[PDB]
């Protein structure tokens, strides 16, 4: 039943989210703050559009952050001070909501 | 009094908006539809961030659309079928909300 399968998928997704939130909380303050700042940035139209891609992107950020925190590195030693540019390289082959809106616009107008 | 001056600025802005809405409504159906589609696209993070720039951008779209409608041209004869790419050229030197969010992210993390 898709009704049930969707509900279970949501349980699973939210459980993975919770675990990812915990990974970020385990990091030092500056890293946890940076992760939350990047989340806000990604929860815009420059961000990923489904759970699969969100999981991949933020899980990668966490992997990088865990290595850096373990070496006592600063966040901006990893990402550069232009953190937004880092998010761009990170997202370059991932569909953004903006990508989807460009399609919506173009499909809407069609050959009018 | 800034309280009053702000209220009057809003009256003036909304009056200009109304007039622009009327310009678009005067266009043929396909052009009016295209304008509304572009509005939705711009009311995202790829769009302008203040009234001055909104006025400039949409007023320019209206100027173009009025010339094209007068020649019986199709909308996509003006913009191309990739309408999103047209909006990009249109916005290339105008600050977007995404531009502002990149700054917020970078300022938030600072040298952490």
Beta bridge partner(s), residue A48: A96
For residues A48-79, b (16+ Cβ closer than 10 Å) or e, as one string? Answer: beeeeebeebbeebbebbeebbeeeebbbebb
DSSP A96: B
Q: Tell me whether residues B112 and A40 touch, CB distance under 8 A.
A: no
- Total of domains in chain B: 1
The domain of A43 spans 2-112
State residue A27 phi and psi, 5-degree precision.
-70, 165
Q: Is A110 left (phi over 0), alpha (psi -120 to 50) or beta?
A: left
Angle CA(A7)–CA(A10)–CA(A15) in degrees, nearest 5?
130
Q: Which of B64, B106, B107, B111 to mutate to test the interface with A (most CBs of A within 10 A)?
A: B106
Q: Tell me whether residues B111 and A76 touch, CB distance under 8 A.
A: yes
**Assigned token pair, A81:** 């001070």
Distance CA A21, CA A108 (A): 38
Q: Which of B105, B108, B110, B111 to mutate to test the interface with A (most CBs of A within 10 A)?
A: B105
Say which of A41, A104, A108 has its CB closest to residue B101. A41
State the angle between helix axes of B83-91 and B51-70 in degrees (0 to 180), rounded to the nearest 10. 130
Beta bridge partner(s), residue B96: B48
Cα of B15 to nearest chain A Cα, Å: 27
**Assigned token pair, A55:** 């999981």
CATH of the domain at B30: 1.10.1900.10
> Which residues in chain A are contacts of B83 at CB distance < 8 A?
105-106, 109
Beta bridge partner(s), residue A96: A48
Residue in this structure with the two tokens 């998010």, named with its chain if needed? A87
The data reach a resolution, in angstroms, of 2.0
Distance CA B105, CA B103 (A): 5
Cα of B6 to nearest chain A Cα, Å: 29
Elucidation technique: X-ray
Distance CA B6, CA B4 (A): 5
Say which of A41, A74, A105 has its CB closest to residue B38. A105
| DSSP letters spanning chain B | -HHHHHHHHHHHHHHHHHHHHHHHHHS-HHHHHHHHHHHHHHTSTTSB-SHHHHHHHHHHHHHHHHHHHHTT--HHHHH-S-HHHHHHHHHTTS-BHHHHHHHHHHHHHTT-
């Amino acid at each position: 039943m898709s009704f049930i399968e969707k509900m279970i998928g949501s349980l699973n997704d939210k459980r993975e989210w919770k675990a990812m939130e915990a990974r970020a909380k385990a990091l030092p303050k500056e890293y946890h703050h940076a992760y939350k700042a990047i989340q806000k940035y990604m929860w815009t139209s420059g961000g990923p559009t489904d759970w699969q891609d969100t999981k991949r992107i933020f899980g990668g950020i966490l992997d990088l952050f865990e290595e850096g925190a373990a070496e006592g590195k600063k966040v901006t030693d990893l990402t550069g001070e232009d953190v937004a540019a880092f998010c761009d390289e990170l997202m370059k082959d991932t569909k953004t909501w903006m990508d989807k809106y460009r399609t919506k616009l173009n499909d809407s107008i069609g050959r009018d």
